[PDB]
């Protein structure tokens, strides 16, 4: 259409509020203060196309997975109301994170004010996905001890709310604070080491490993470290500047690690629920 016509631009001609990764040299959407143009640009090739579609499809995927989870037969759970509330809190974190994410990457080039608003929501979305993932996990892991389950539910909320507060600060979004952001969200996920050591000290080395938690938690910690490393160091576009403008740059690979990391976490807590249903809902040990 003849309306809202635009061409991609090199990094140098971008305004300051859009210059976030100097290794993406060309292919940028120019500043365009039209929500019509920004939403139409989802169907165009530019630095943000992959960022947008990884989390747009990932967002409808967790929404479909969450609806199907809610309509699962109550007969396949031990406590279907509380089990669906803890899984639902995880889905709410995943859907909100992916929604705030693709919305931000879509309306990013609109204006300085709009980009500030959605970057604050984007950041907050990562804290909600991390806090929400702890909820079904603490639930099944401390199924018999309610006091440590509730203490850890408090901790991850206090820390998560502190990440949402710091991710509101204007300096936090500057390119120099990239490794601060990577450390803040990394610390939040890796704070699961505390209830993990508590769980293996209490339950046993054999008991934690046999029930697959140790291997599955090492995988999660790998995706956390590997995901934060790519994001913070801008690999691979740091090594091939100008070659990764459209495909497989750091932020794009990171977006893939978020939807994958949320899927291996879901698969993990979904097995924990299958195990709880196999053994029933009491304590004999």
């Amino acid at each position, epitope marked *: 259409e003849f*309306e*809202g016509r635009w061409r991609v*631009i090199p990094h140098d001609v971008l305004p300051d509020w859009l210059k976030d990764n100097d290794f993406l040299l060309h292919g940028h959407r120019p*500043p365009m*203060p*039209s929500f019509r143009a920004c939403f139409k640009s989802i169907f165009r090739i530019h630095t943000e196309t992959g960022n947008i579609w990884t989390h747009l499809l990932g967002c409808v995927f967790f929404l479909c997975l969450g609806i199907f989870y809610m309509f699962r037969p109550n007969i396949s759970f031990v406590a279907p109301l509380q089990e669906k509330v803890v899984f639902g809190l995880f889905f709410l974190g995943a859907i909100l994170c992916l929604s705030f994410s693709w919305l931000f990457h879509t309306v990013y080039c609109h204006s300085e004010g709009v980009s500030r608003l959605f970057s604050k929501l984007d950041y907050s979305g990562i804290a909600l996905l991390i806090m929400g993932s702890f909820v079904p996990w603490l639930y099944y892991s401390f199924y018999c001890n309610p006091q440590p389950c509730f203490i850890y539910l408090i901790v991850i909320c206090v820390l998560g709310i502190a990440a949402i507060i710091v991710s509101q600060w204007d300096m936090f979004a500057t390119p120099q604070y990239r490794g601060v952001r990577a450390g803040v969200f990394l610390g939040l996920g890796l704070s699961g080491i505390i209830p993990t050591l508590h769980y293996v000290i209490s339950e046993g080395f054999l008991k934690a490993a046999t029930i697959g938690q140790i291997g599955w938690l090492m995988l999660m910690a790998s995706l956390y470290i590997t995901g934060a490393a790519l994001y913070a160091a801008r690999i691979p576009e740091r090594f091939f500047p100008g070659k990764c403008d459209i495909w497989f740059h750091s932020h794009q690979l990171f977006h893939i690690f978020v939807v994958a990391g949320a899927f291996v976490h879901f698969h993990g807590v979904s097995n924990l629920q299958e195990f709880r249903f196999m053994i029933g809902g009491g304590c004999s040990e």
Partner: antibody
Amino acid sequence: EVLLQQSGPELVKPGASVRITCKASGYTFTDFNMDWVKQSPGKSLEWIGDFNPNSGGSIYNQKFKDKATFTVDKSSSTAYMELRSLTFEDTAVYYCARETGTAWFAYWGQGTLVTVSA
Amino acid sequence: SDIQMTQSPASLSASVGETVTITCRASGNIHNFLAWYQQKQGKSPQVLVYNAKTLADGVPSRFSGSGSGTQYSLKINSLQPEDFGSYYCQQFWSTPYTFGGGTKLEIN
């Protein structure tokens, strides 16, 4: 610094044709659309059309479709506009103006005055 | 010849230090894809404000763009002697791109 440098003035007979040169420097020529603008004496500005040097595509304002033709010489970083079958109404200053993603014009040529005189 | 740009006033004269406001009205919504230009006598135009409110590189803070939809404005705070010239609005939302008729600003 970016600079758009146009060719000198033309004093031509009616029915003649002119080619306005627009040498573009200080940037990667193919990165931005170049637009042509007319300003009749003591008048406002009229968008003639835009030209894409990378794709080679042009979009003309219907008013000037049969009058203006945009060409390019990518190797020399220059935009061209040929004006056909000149008339007294074509006495105007013609500008090349450069886009930056969208069609707002940060950079402009000094203008070429074309005078159609008999 | 689709979007008509209506500039107002057509001309005005104010003294140095005063504030002026030039308004632009589009015949259709231009989604903030509006730019303002200042043009000096015998010289080529120069961009002041683009994307309705974004102040261009090198332009003084005295110039401010404002507006939305079909009604946009250019405000010149504290007029300076060098502010004399022709002012033009422009829409780049739909082809063909169009300009306002201009505003001649005289400085007393």
